[PDB]
């Protein structure tokens, strides 16, 4: 149930990171996931390479 449990480099283990002030905007992870999935889908629909 620990939603905010994350890697604590300073402590050296696993602890809540909201106490470590490690936060990022939602439109970084969301954008990365969306663009990466789209790129993977684009790559998967390729079956040949042609030299011009």
């Amino acid at each position: 149930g620990e939603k905010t449990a994350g890697i604590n480099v300073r402590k050296g283990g696993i602890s809540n990171i909201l106490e470590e002030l490690v936060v990022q905007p939602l439109l970084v992870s969301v954008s990365a996931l969306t663009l990466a999935t789209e790129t993977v889908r684009s790559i998967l629909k390729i079956d040949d390479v042609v030299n011009t």
């Binding site: 684009s42 629909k45 390729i46 079956d47 040949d48 390479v49 042609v50 011009t52």
Partner: peptide
């Protein structure tokens, strides 16, 4: 499926 058109020129344009 799609195709990859890898140009061999100096710019080496990539086209899918």
């Amino acid at each position: 499926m799609d195709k990859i058109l890898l140009s061999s020129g100096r710019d080496a344009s990539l086209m899918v």
